[PDB]
Amino acid sequence: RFLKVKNWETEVVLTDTLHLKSTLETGCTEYICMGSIMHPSATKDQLFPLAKEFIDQYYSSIKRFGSKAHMERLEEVNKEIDTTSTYQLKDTELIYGAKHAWRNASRCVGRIQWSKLQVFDARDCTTAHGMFNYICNHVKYATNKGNLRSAITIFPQRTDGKHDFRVWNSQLIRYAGYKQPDGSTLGDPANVQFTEICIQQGWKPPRGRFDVLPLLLQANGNDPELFQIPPELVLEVPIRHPKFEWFKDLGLKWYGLPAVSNMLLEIGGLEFSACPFSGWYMGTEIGVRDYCDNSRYNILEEVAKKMNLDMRKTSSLWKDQALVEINIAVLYSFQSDKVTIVDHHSATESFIKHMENEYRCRGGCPADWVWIVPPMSGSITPVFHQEMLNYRLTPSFEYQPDPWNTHVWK
Amino acid sequence: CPRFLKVKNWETEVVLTDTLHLKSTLETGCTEYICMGSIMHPPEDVATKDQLFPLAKEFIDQYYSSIKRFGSKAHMERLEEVNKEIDTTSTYQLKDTELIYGAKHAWRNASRCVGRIQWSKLQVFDARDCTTAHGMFNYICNHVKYATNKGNLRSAITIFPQRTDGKHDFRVWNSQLIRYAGYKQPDGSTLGDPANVQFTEICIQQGWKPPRGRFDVLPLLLQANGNDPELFQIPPELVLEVPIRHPKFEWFKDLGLKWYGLPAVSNMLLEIGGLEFSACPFSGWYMGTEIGVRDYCDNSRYNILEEVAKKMNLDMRKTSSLWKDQALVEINIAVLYSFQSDKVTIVDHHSATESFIKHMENEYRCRGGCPADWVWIVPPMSGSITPVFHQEMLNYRLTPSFEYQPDPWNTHVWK
Ligand code: HEM
Ligand code: HEM
Ligand SMILES: CN[C@H](C)Cc1cc(C#N)cc(OCc2ccc3c(C)cc(N)nc3c2)c1
Ligand SMILES: CN[C@H](C)Cc1cc(C#N)cc(OCc2ccc3c(C)cc(N)nc3c2)c1
Ligand SMILES: C[C@H](O)[C@H](O)[C@H]1CNc2nc(N)[nH]c(=O)c2N1
Ligand SMILES: C[C@H](O)[C@H](O)[C@H]1CNc2nc(N)[nH]c(=O)c2N1
Ligand SMILES: [Zn+2]
């Protein structure tokens, strides 16, 4: 069936046909919706239909479906699976695949940018040192002195599962977190465990509030190895406020480059367990979640104090006031330093225009309202009033288990 | 379907186990391949005899199970009597105890409601003896006066006769018992509340003389026993209102805003044991953001963000200054302050969401689950700094339930 989605602000109605193409499951059933669950629950014979599906849509995309090149590619891929239990993507295919995993990422509000993705092919990498070099080149290219550029670096595909490439970091650039004797936490609490693993593996921690973590890199299933990203490659922004001169005294800072490194990229049945991808920040990622989550830096108290707000009763909305001032500061700081950042109004507005684009040229756009709507000021952004259909298309980015739960060492 | 489903809270690491989803009765709209969780809503005939039997049994079973009399003589006798009623009259009547139980549970089962910790405290008014629109007016006035209670609001529901053949429906045409009029102008602008322009137009056609102001309380438009609906003015002394002012900003009162104290939704259908109560106005008290974010700051509503921001002398040239967010907070501060000052019950979104988490935990423990719609439960501002943002939720449909129904002017056969 054709499915309609309505914007209750603009009364615009879109018709979704694209969902008919999806084959992966969402987790919901006719009787139970699991839309707010974070993660709802190969062989030769499995592999070829997935390969064929992907090759077909690639040649469909370049308007050469059923061509000589198409026919021959199908042939080629089948001999390669038969004789080696897997196959290799052409470079064009790799690029097509990576862009479309981004395009299909229902939880990403930044997808208007999807076809502007710099794809670095690192499938010839064999060691952790090689991984480090590739990652440094990625970071340097994507940072571009503040004029951030979207990029993905793709390491060799999974083979037998015992020879995985993995970036153990969840992002290429993150701050360490230290569990105090106090019982409290210095730095970023989200990373306390990873930090402990780095220390255990020989990393000498500065024990500051914003210590950049080392890279911890696993090549071909071997034990991971530690590397320091050269400091000059790590662009950082000191957070100050355009009116509160005391804000700089808080000593806050953050890094310019968000580069997620712990997801899995799947294309045509092949699995890329190491594929760090990066873009630029939406301000709330830092200002709302990274700084104000109770389980994160948790600075609301300190700010509201410096703002001399009455914090006895919750109905004074002192938290809400402090939250807005923090996000103002973050946006102002990045902008003053000419580091690319987008506010949640501009981003969601861009996403609405993107949905309209996709419905017109593609027959729909999979989108996850729970993640698309920003973590503050929800209903005064246009996505709040936008009905969305969430479904799973491939190529995709998938979650995978943390390496320290699978890997067995020396 | 799996017997045990787990939900996690990503802030506290607490994991809860849901078994209640097994009692799910209706569909959600979702499938294995698509999720419709952000769709707002995923013939004039009635339940046949054969349709009605198992629906009634299911409900009667559940009622006798709740009073710890399952399998009792009284339980079996009640089943027999209901069955005979359905067989001889193709419908049946609920006992007062059952009616009260059913209403309370429709609320308990309402996945989109953040206020459900209060579900067992609901004054139920039985109006199944009502025959006319004047009588409906009488019941509604008594409902309003009771629930308002001079600002100390008390949750209540008034239940009018159930549907029979569908040509004798009782309906409140209003969407809430108390709402302000909206007037479209010839120049295309709107006076009052833009959400209510269509209903306002219907009232004016029905004979209502409109004051044409910014905050004109609408008349009740009341349909009894399938007859043409009739207009009634709610006695102004029964309509509690709060003028909105701000603790710091003296100029805020000059904006001339006010709102009414009693939120009383009147266009939903109450479904119990297969019976349909098409007129069942229910009321509680407000969460601040219902007024301060949606009513006032929605673009298609009163839309005051600009005027507030201008009086705050905010830089409104670039969105990245977050002038909208700044203004939104002050407005919501004003709403909570004005209600508290006038001693009219209201709850802020931090307190409400914290109570909902405690409520949800309790329901998982005592009931085996709590259906919840994250998309509606999370408040329209400051989402992630409330504890429901990080709380995984399962959504499913239990009966008794509150349901959407078509607007009555779309289906009514005018006499
Ligand atoms: C270019 C600017 C971009 C912006 C502003 C942006 C914005 C966002 C935001 C705000 C989120 C939610 C993050 C969270 O709350 O944890 C997100 C999720 C996501 N983004 Fe984007 N993004 C951008 C680029 C990209 C790129 C280049 C990729 C991949 C090639 C990508 C893939 C994803 C994926 C896969 C998710 C969801 C991951 C999950 O399911 O947990 N994004 N994005
Ligand atoms: C006692 C204080 C109450 C509070 C603070 C409260 C709060 C809320 C809020 C904020 C919403 C979302 C409304 C929206 O955004 O449109 C809601 C929805 C809802 N409430 Fe409650 N409520 C209360 C009482 C009640 C009562 C007494 C009932 C019925 C007996 C009820 C039944 C419902 C239903 C069915 C919805 C969903 C309506 C829909 O699906 O459109 N609530 N509530
Ligand atoms: C506490 N929040 C947790 C870490 C949720 C999360 C998990 C994973 C994984 N695996 C990956 C995640 O990535 C979100 C994401 C991914 C890519 C992004 C890019 C490329 C840019 C950007 N501005 N934000 C992103 C945000 C998030
Ligand atoms: C413009 N948005 C529309 C009006 C959404 C909506 C539709 C319907 C219906 N039918 C019913 C709705 O009810 C929400 C509701 C219901 C009862 C409430 C009670 C009893 C108290 C309270 N504070 N809010 C409520 C909020 C909402
Ligand atoms: C499109 C979206 O489903 C729609 O705007 C919903 C979102 N969440 C909501 N949540 C509440 N509480 N009230 C609403 O009216 C809505 N609207
Ligand atoms: C339980 C809930 O699904 C979880 O907190 C989600 C909600 N929405 C989110 N939305 C975004 N953008 N990022 C998140 O991490 C989350 N967390
Ligand atoms: Zn769903």
Curated annotation (Swiss-Prot), chain B:
Tissue-by-tissue expression: Isoform 1 is ubiquitously expressed: detected in skeletal muscle and brain, also in testis, lung and kidney, and at low levels in heart, adrenal gland and retina. Not detected in the platelets. Isoform 3 is expressed only in testis. Isoform 4 is detected in testis, skeletal muscle, lung, and kidney, at low levels in the brain, but not in the heart and adrenal gland.
Subcellular location(s) of the protein: Cell membrane, Sarcolemma; Cell projection, Dendritic spine
Ligand binding ((6R)-L-erythro-5,6,7,8-tetrahydrobiopterin): S38, V375, W376, F389
Positions of L-arginine binding: Q176, W285, Y286, E290
Processing after translation: Ubiquitinated; mediated by STUB1/CHIP in the presence of Hsp70 and Hsp40 (in vitro).
Family to which the UniProt record says this protein belongs: Belongs to the NOS family.
Physiological role: Produces nitric oxide (NO) which is a messenger molecule with diverse functions throughout the body. In the brain and peripheral nervous system, NO displays many properties of a neurotransmitter. Probably has nitrosylase activity and mediates cysteine S-nitrosylation of cytoplasmic target proteins such SRR.
Domain comment (free text): The PDZ domain participates in protein-protein interaction, and is responsible for targeting nNos to synaptic membranes. Mediates interaction with VAC14.
Full protein name: Nitric oxide synthase 1
Source species: Homo sapiens (Human)
Gene: NOS1
